[PDB]
Amino acid sequence: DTHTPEFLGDSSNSGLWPNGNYGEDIIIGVLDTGVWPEHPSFSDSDMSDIPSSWKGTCETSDDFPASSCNKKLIGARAFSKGIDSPRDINGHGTHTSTTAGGSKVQNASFYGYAKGQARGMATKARIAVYKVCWSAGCPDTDILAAMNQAIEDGVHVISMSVGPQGYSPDYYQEASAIGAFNAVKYGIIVSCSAGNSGPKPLTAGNISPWILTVGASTIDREFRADVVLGDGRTFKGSSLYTGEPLQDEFFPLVYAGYAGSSRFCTNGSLDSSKVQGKIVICDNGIISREEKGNEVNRAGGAGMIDVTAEDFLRAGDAYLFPATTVTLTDGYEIEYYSVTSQSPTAKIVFLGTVIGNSPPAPKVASFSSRGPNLWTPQILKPDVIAPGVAILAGWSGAAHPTDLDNDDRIVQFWLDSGTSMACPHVSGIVALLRKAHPSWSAAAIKSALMTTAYNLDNSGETITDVATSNASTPFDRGAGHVHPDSALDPGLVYDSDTEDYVSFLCAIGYNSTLIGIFTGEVPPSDICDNYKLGSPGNLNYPSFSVAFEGDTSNVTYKRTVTNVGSSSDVVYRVKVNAPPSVDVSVSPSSLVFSKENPSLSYEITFTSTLAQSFGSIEWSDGTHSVRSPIAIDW
Ligand SMILES: *[C@@H]1O[C@H](CO)[C@@H](O)[C@H](O)[C@H]1NC(C)=O
């Protein structure tokens, strides 16, 4: 996107973009709807030859020519054995691959909206496309085939904006869990969407401890079309209206519930004699916001105010006729004015793309799937948040912004929302860290993003939830919002390997048969005799999650921190922000690293003095802060 790198603090002056070489020579595998190869984001201008280490290929066709793949887009495979080409007829695959690794495109916009240079977070990375998503859906057998193939091909990062529609299956049933487990031993980082079933709890998916589970948040950008009434009251509105601008004049205002047989502005509901030259107020439901604009237009209306069912706005309404979207409560004020005033009038003031500190940002997206982790309460999910609301990236040439009959618009760049949009921002940042830190484990790269993630919005208050207008919790934002320039130099990391993951599979009570799904062998029945993790919460993880069985319960977890800073002789001190109704003790409270001792362990005890409660711990030396959120359930 044209603004997210700037919101993330990426720049060519310093930090992760230069030290990671914009991801030069890192390969990102994208498991999604495929790709639209005829697109300027796949330009390979000023890029070196594909390294011979790369064992990937391009499955060619009339529909997908050999000339599709170049030095930038270096891979394209399709996986339909679960029930045709890697070509992207949806748009979603082009949007995500392009967010993670798109070459720089000048003057990118959606009809002037979000205008700037569109850049992947890893602008110089190679992209390998693994099409696993068809109209029927994304079959488990094809997800697992593509992950195992991306590993064989030699990608560095798997970006997977695919997951369960609602509540998640258990690990052994999830392709993502099995695939990502295999990717670990090769240092391959797996970045996944948390899902779009928020704000209700327990909805997070792709929740394996060895996956970087990403939630969605807002940036400091709105797409603004305000309503002014004739009595001088003003209301915020949202629009991606793409047509000729409306006259800067007041129009007579009428509600569809008065002017027609339907407050929903269904086909043929408006009486033309009541809506000629009028702005018509339509209530949300039955049909899309844009389809309501077709009815207002058919009946001779000048414009449309759509009233949403929610008390917040999310940009995404590519109106073909002049219109703006307002909240439930603002809508009713405008409706009540339209019905009770002698001569009600309104103007829609189209302000376009607006960037500023009101409302504050980031906020956790209402739709972002939420913890707790449904299967393992002792693992906090999701892990981080990243931009996922109204993100400009690449789109399919075979897809209109809407499914309206009269929508013929073909765009290079579309604004889209989801944990789908958040995940590839993280996959791109992870590519950058891989280049800056070639020796780090997958776990160490993730740890670095989590222990530097920020938790205050640009107003200085705890990041809020769009759904509540109140402070969010770690079940909403994980360890916080990615801070790429800080993640380059985290000081300490919480490292983990495949053997730690087997100990976790043993701790959650999987028998040898289920462990064998992950390890790819028939282990002996007594395999878990050889693993002694205890609680799943003892897995070396950059966050803490406690599930108290009783009111006076106490829980102790073990962690190990590894110094990855440039100085071997460094001293860290712990600071504790204890959750309400929990006493927290850390032993030891000081860690003295040296060449002899580059890794040190500590124990943290949580004692209930009591529902859910939150806090944090941090380890600091002279220049580093290693922060971990704490979540408590009773
Ligand atoms: C192992 O666990 C699975 C899933 O719970 C179960 O269906 C299977 O019968 C188990 N195998 C043995 C030998 O207990």
Residues 6+ apart with CB under 8 A from 336: none
Tokens 């748009």 sit on residue? 91
For residue 525, which atom of ligand 1 is closest to its CA? 13
Core vs surface per residue 553-568: b (16+ CB within 10 A) or e: eebebebebbbbbeee
Q: Note the helical H segments in 399-483.
A: 419-436, 442-451, 474-477
Residue with tokens 């985290």, as numbered in its chain: 490
User: Are 439 and 493 contacting, i.e. CB atoms less than 8 angstroms apart?
Assistant: no
Pick from 375, 511, 515 the residue to mutate for probing ligand 1's pocket: most ligand atoms within 8 Å of its CB. 511
Atom of ligand 1 nearest to the CA of 512: 1
Atom of ligand 1 nearest to the CA of 511: 1
Whether residues 227 and 325 fall in one domain: yes
Same domain, 25 and 60: yes
Half-sphere exposure of 209 (CA within 13 A, CB side): 30
Residues 364 and 470 in one domain: yes
CA angle 549, 370, 97 (to 5 degrees): 140
Residue 475, both tokens:
């079940």
**Bridge-based pairing state of the strands 212-217 and 544-547:** unpaired
- Amino acid identity of 448? A
Based on its alpha-carbon atoms, the radius of gyration of the chain, rounded to whole angstroms, reads 26
Cα 484 to the center of its chain, rounded Å: 15
Residue 205 Cα to ligand 1 midpoint, Å, equals 23
Whether 177 contacts 379, CB under 8 Å: no
Task: Find tokens 């793409």 and name the residue.
Answer: 242
How many angstroms is it from 524 CA to the middle of ligand 1?
Answer: 14
Dihedral over Cα of 163, 164, 169, 174: its sign? negative
Burial string for 444-468 (b: 16+ CB within 10 Å, else e) reads bbbbbbbbbbbbebbeeeebbbbbe
Whether residue 75 contacts residue 153, with contact meaning beta carbons closer than 8 Å, is answered with yes
CA of 515 to the centre of ligand 1 (A): 11
Number of H helices, E strands in the chain: 15, 29
226: tokens are 């305000």
Q: Are residues 186 and 270 in the same domain?
A: no
Distance (Å, whole) CA 614 – CA 634: 12
Question: Which residue puts its alpha carbon closest to atom 1 of ligand 1?
Answer: 511
In this structure, which amino acid lies at residue 217? S
Q: Are 591 and 621 in contact (CB under 8 A)?
A: no
Cα–Cα distance measured from residue 155 to residue 105, given in angstroms and rounded to the nearest whole number:
24
- Pair 370, 444 in one domain: yes
Among 448, 479, 486, smallest CA distance to 463 is for 479
In the annotation, is 400 catalytic?
Answer: no
Q: Does residue 173 have its Cβ closer than 6 Å to ligand 1?
A: no
Instruction: Name the DSSP class of 267.
Output: T
Per annotation, catalytic residue among 366, 420, 608, 613: 420
Method: X-ray
Residue from 512, 514, 518 whose mutation best tests the ligand 1 pocket (most atoms within 8 A of CB):
514
CB 569 within 8 A of CB 591: no
CA 499–ligand 1 middle distance (angstroms): 22
- Residue 397 structure tokens: 């040439």
**What is the distance in A from the centroid of ligand 1 to the CA of 9?**
49
544 in the same domain as 480: no
Whole-number Å distance between alpha carbons of 38 and 414: 16
376 and 408 together in one domain: no
| Tokens standing for residue 30 | 């994208």
Resolution, given in Å to one decimal, reads 1.7
How far is the CA of 173 from the CAs of 129, 140, 381, 394, in angstroms?
24, 9, 18, 32
Could you tell me which of 281, 230, 290, 276 has the C-alpha nearest to residue 257?
281
C-alpha dihedral (77, 81, 82, 88), degrees to nearest 10 = 30
Residue that is last in its domain, among 329, 354, 379: 354
Q: Provide φ and ψ at 538, rounded to 5°.
A: -85, -10
Q: Is 521 helix (H, G, I), strand (E, B) or coil?
A: coil
Whole-number Å distance, alpha carbon 280 to ligand 1 midpoint, is 61
Please pick, among 1, 10, 32, 88, the residue that the annotation labels catalytic.
32
349 lines ligand 1 (CB under 6 A): no
Could you tell me the distance, in angstroms and rounded to a whole number, from the CA of residue 510 to the centre of ligand 1? 8
**Side-chain-side CA neighbours of residue 177 (13 Å):** 22
Q: How many angstroms from the chain centroid is the CA of residue 577?
A: 28
HSE-CB for 78 with a 13 A CA cutoff:
17
Q: What are phi and psi of 580, to 5 degrees?
A: -50, 130
Q: Across the strands, what pairs with 618?
A: 575, 627
Structure token digits, residue 157: 């990062």
Residue with tokens 């195992």: 148
Amino acid at 604: I
Please report how many Cα atoms fall inside a 13 Å half-sphere around the Cα of residue 355, on the Cβ side: 10
Looking at the fold, whether 429 and 510 belong to one and the same domain comes out as yes
- Which of 418, 433, 468 terminates a domain? The answer is 418
255 is written with which tokens?
Answer: 């509600």
Note whether 113 and 3 are same-domain residues.
yes
Q: What is the dihedral of CA 8, 9, 13, 18, to 10 degrees?
A: -40
- Under 8 Å CB-to-CB from 193, ≥6 apart: which residues? 160, 161, 162, 163, 205, 206, 214, 418, 419, 420, 422, 423
Which ligand 1 atom minimizes the distance to the CA of 510? 2
Residue of minimum CA distance from atom 9 in ligand 1? 513
Say if residue 368 is in the same domain as residue 485. yes
Give how far the C-alpha of residue 278 lies from the chain's centroid of Cα atoms, to the nearest Å. 40
Burial class (CB in 10 A: 0-12, 13-18, 19+), 10: buried
Given the residues 39, 92, 400, 481, select the one marked as catalytic.
92
Cβ 514 under 6 angstroms from ligand 1: yes
* Omega prior to 629 cis, within 30 of 0: no
Contact 390, 367 (CB under 8 A): no
Q: Is 92 a catalytic residue?
A: yes
Q: What is the biggest distance separating any 2 CA atoms in the chain, rounded to whole angstroms?
A: 86
Rounded distance between C-alpha atoms, residue 426 and residue 442, angstroms: 13
Residues 6+ apart with CB under 8 A from 101: 23, 28, 30, 120, 121, 122, 123, 125, 126, 127, 427, 428, 431
Question: For the chain, what is the domain count?
Answer: 4
Same domain as 70, residue 197: no
Is 32 marked active-site?
Answer: yes
Contact 457, 7 (CB under 8 A): no
Q: Which domain holds residue 14?
A: 1-162+388-418
Alpha-carbon distances of 230 from 252, 337, 602, rounded to whole Å: 9, 10, 66
Distance in Å, CA 375 to ligand 1 centroid: 17
Q: Which of 399, 418, 437 is the last residue of a domain?
A: 418
CA of 514 to the centre of ligand 1 (A): 7
Task: State how far the Cα of 70 lies from the Cα of 276, in Å rounded to an integer.
Answer: 54
Residue 357, ligand 1, Cβ within 6 A: no
How far is ligand 1, taken at its centre, from the CA of residue 537, in Å?
24
Nearest-atom number in ligand 1 for the CA of 172 is: 4
Q: Is the CB of 511 under 6 A from ligand 1?
A: yes
DSSP symbol at 275? H
Chain CA centroid to CA 359, Å: 20
Same domain, 204 and 71: no
Q: Nearest to residue 255, comparing CAs of 323, 321, 342, 334?
A: 334
Mutate which of 513, 517, 522, 527 for ligand 1 pocket (most atoms within 8 A of beta carbon): 513
Asked if residues 323 and 317 have their Cβ atoms less than 8 Å apart, the reply is yes
Quick check: helix, strand or coil at residue 590? strand
